[PDB]
Nucleic acid binder design. Structure first.
Ligand SMILES: C[C@@H]1C[C@@H]([C@H](O)CC2CC(=O)NC(=O)C2)C(=O)[C@@H](C)C1
Lengths: 102, 51, 42, 52
RNA sequence: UUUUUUUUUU
RNA sequence: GCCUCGAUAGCUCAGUUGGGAGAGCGUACGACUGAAGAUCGUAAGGUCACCAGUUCGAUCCUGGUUCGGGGCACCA
RNA sequence: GCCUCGAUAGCUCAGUUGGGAGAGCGUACGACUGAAGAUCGUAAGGUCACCAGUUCGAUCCUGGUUCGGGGCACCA
RNA sequence: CUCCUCGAAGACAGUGUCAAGCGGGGAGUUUGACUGGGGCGGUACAUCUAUCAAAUCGUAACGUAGGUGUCCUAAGGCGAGCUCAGAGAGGACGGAAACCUCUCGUAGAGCAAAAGGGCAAAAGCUUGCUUGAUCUUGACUUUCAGUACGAGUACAGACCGCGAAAGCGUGGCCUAUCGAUCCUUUUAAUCCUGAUUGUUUCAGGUAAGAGGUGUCAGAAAAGUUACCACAGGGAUAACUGGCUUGUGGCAGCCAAGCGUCCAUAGCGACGUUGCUUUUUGAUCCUUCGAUGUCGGCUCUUCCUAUCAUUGCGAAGCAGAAUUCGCCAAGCGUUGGAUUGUUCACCCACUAAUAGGGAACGUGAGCUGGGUUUAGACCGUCGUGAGACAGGUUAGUUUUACCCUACUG
RNA sequence: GACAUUGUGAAGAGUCAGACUCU
RNA sequence: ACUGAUUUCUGCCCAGUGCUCUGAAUGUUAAAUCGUAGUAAUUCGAGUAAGCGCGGGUAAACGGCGGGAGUAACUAUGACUC
RNA sequence: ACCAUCUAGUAGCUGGUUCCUUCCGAAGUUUCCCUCAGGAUAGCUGGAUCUCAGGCAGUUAUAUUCGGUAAAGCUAAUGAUU
RNA sequence: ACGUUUCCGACCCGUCUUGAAACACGGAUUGCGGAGUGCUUGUCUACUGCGAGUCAAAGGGUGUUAAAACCUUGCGGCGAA
């Protein structure tokens, strides 16, 4: 899958019109240790009793829905669009050619 | 499982020493003035079998 | 016993056990640096 | 002990026991699911017709 | 450094 | 007994829609040598186990007879 | 019966996504040697097991077929 | 004389707390489902196409042939132009096949992929420009409980793309290509809250996505038990019985051939019609608050598909002998070696050494050799506990005095 | 392994600006 | 712990799993400690022991200990070769 | 091991579940579930009744449509095939 | 009418089950005992009182046929957004 690095698309921000967006790939942030879930989980785990929450062990997916973060070049408003599952992804790769020798 | 014979030996029951007829402990004399600054003479009264 | 059982009389696991093994497990050749007949001087 | 055993044996009899109920007659009166622009114009038309 | 063999009788 | 497999020159093995029976060893002769052995060339080795059938045509395909070889064959 | 694995010169074995078919021995030629063997210099060699398909092109990728090999085949 | 009892070690060891490593020595728990018993095998578990399917829709099996977890900045959108597979006839090197030209060419091509539909100034090929694969809410279809996800349909509002325009466009020509709660994370507002007043961090919220549950409406999960246990099950296997008869056994029909000649004395191929339940299978109807599960011994009776004997007919019947067939179960159908053996094989006699049934007759009749618990050995397998229609050895055989039957 | 129990002296090295750190 | 009188012997394998032996080993490592930023919670970085990983030993430790072709003057077999 | 208690432990499984008449009267099917001897869900069923006093029907007629099964065809496409 | 005798009919009940007289299980006989309850919380239905209200709690006051009955609520529950 090849996706260009620039896209003219609708902007939900102040623009409310079609504008240019710089496209990048979204990446999950670092998990904080002061999130309520982490605090609760740490307190629950501390002490005697062993593991207190399930541990997932049956992964079956081999891909992920790639999320494109597109930032408007006029207000810096950022959109997130998921695309379909793909094994290989590249941003702004070389475009396909037609009628060329191999 | 159950405790193994090795483990059962520490309680010191049927595994205690059979010492009814022992003739005593083998020990030199306590260190004292005679042995530290000279010598003391003793007479071998007996040679015996210690079970 | 750790060696007991089986349809054949066999240990089933290496008989050399580490020094810090638990009380009910420390049987056999404890902390053995080597095994087998001594060929030479030791 | 196989236990899938699908069948449609006694189902028409059950369906017909209390009759097959046909749809009501007012179902064609509702203006639900009709074009929004048409509905808007209908509201405007109805809001203005002088009664007398 | 390497260096094996040579049918039978005459 | 049943599932089968195979039977080709004195011996051992190839071969085919089915349209020729080949190879080796062995045998006879010739070349070679003082003479042999070995080596070469030729001549050679067959009812294609037997019978019946199907085919325009069967060593091969179908059935049967003989010979053998490999496997299968209560029970709780 | 089920589950896999493999099939490549005369023999034993590699090989690539798919664009090369290799290695050793064997075979053939020349040389060294009185001659053979070792040695030196060369050459030719495979059913990529058989088919169908996939894409530009398949020994390779997919499916089926033939042969071989391995493992399971347990209660009562 | 000296307030060190005499030595050794000495602020290390030891002890207290926390941290990390090891830790079946020990604890707790788990060790999917479907399934012509279970296990092994497979996935028919979420899922699409053609068929089954009996002309609306719908319709099952571990029914049949296949497919799915992807791929694509174009293989999405749109405008324009063109026509494909193939055939025929021509053209230096050029050949069956390179490239050029003309005729014919209903799609016999192509359209990412399975199958089926669909498509010709296009949905295919070439090419220009593009990002409608964007933002927002409702309605509806499909599955359906008329729940949810997924997928899709027709609009409405916005901003856009292509086109001269009408128009078309919310991803792929259509039918599969996928995911709840909790938690984490990101994007959004010049947003709300932190309740003693405020500011800034920090944390928590409202809305939309992603991180994944393939057992796909979504637990966190390895074995063994022959030392075994409990609640049940004839919903479910192992022995008898029942249906079936593939397999086993037995008997016919036609005659191509064999039989020196001669199809039918005796046989009878290629084909084909049956019968039996003494084989083994298939099934799962009865029995799991139990029908004692092999064989032998003993003892009755029964059937013949007749080995012998009685009476006969036919021969490739000149007779010991032998073969075929008919009426015929009255009466016989043995002694032994090996094996638990049924079978098998051999020795010997014999008129003959026929085949079978009766809950594979017969264990409150025996025996207990085998199978079939617990002990033990070997081989293979397993890390191990342990497994093995593989071999081996030892292993409790209970009760009738009742009714009937039978004997007196 | 860290901290406490844990005190009294020397030598070296390193930090600082008489203290600290180690050995 | 295994083996199991006497006699005679006890072959090859340290790759796997164990056990064990050294450690210079910044390869990987917790708490504590130290440094940077911040007004603080806190953030970032450095250290960071044993273990593990690397190296050596050990089978009278657990255990394990192969295939296919050709070949001798009748055949057969194959000492021999690949 | 035995004794008492937690303890009337839990059981989707087995057994039982006690008067008479009258009226109505089933289901073994759909979807989801570590679901398949069980549940929830819809269906089938009973009871209470309430609002009314012509629009309905497991039946026909008229009109109009849908379908690709039986038959038919292969001297019509595809695939066999003398 | 639980006597006898005739003619016709007549398999043993309960249960699980597609299917029981079953070669399926429980049942030798008789007496007595023996199993859908209590409470909390919901919801619907029926009846009663009052009705934008209704019920009032703990408590207090009184009551000697005094655990009753009778009286008593700026405030509380539910309802009225
Ligand atoms: C989104 C997916 C799931 C999620 C999480 O494990 C799921 C939860 C579900 C729940 O309700 N309780 C739990 O204890 C686990 C998670 O962190 C990852 C595995 C990814």
């Amino acid at each position: 899958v090849n996706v260009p690095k620039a896209r003219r698309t609708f902007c939900d921000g102040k623009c409310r019109k079609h504008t240019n967006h710089k496209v990048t790939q979204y990446k999950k942030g670092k998990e904080s240790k002061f999130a309520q879930g982490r605090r609760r989980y740490d307190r629950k785990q501390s002490g005697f009793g062993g593991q207190t929450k399930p541990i997932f062990r049956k992964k079956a997916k081999t891909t992920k829905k790639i999320v494109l973060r597109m930032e408007c070049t006029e207000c810096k408003h950022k959109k997130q669009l998921p695309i379909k599952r793909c094994k290989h992804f590249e941003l702004g790769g070389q475009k396909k050619s037609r009628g060329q020798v191999i | 499982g159950r405790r193994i014979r090795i483990q059962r030996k520490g309680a010191g029951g049927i595994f205690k020493s059979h010492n009814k007829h022992r003739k005593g402990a083998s020990k030199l004399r306590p260190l004292d003035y005679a042995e530290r600054h000279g010598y003391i003479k003793g007479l071998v009264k007996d040679i015996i079998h210690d079970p | 016993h750790p060696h007991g059982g089986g349809n054949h009389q066999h240990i089933g696991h290496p008989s050399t056990v580490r020094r810090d093994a638990s009380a009910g497990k420390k049987v056999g050749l404890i902390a053995a640096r080597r095994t087998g007949r001594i060929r030479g001087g030791k | 002990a196989k236990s899938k055993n699908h069948t449609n044996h006694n189902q028409n009899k059950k369906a017909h026991r209390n009759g097959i109920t046909k749809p009501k007659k007012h179902i064609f009166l509702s203006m639900k699911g009709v074009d929004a622009k048409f509905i808007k114009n209908l509201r405007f038309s109805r809001k203005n017709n002088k009664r007398q």
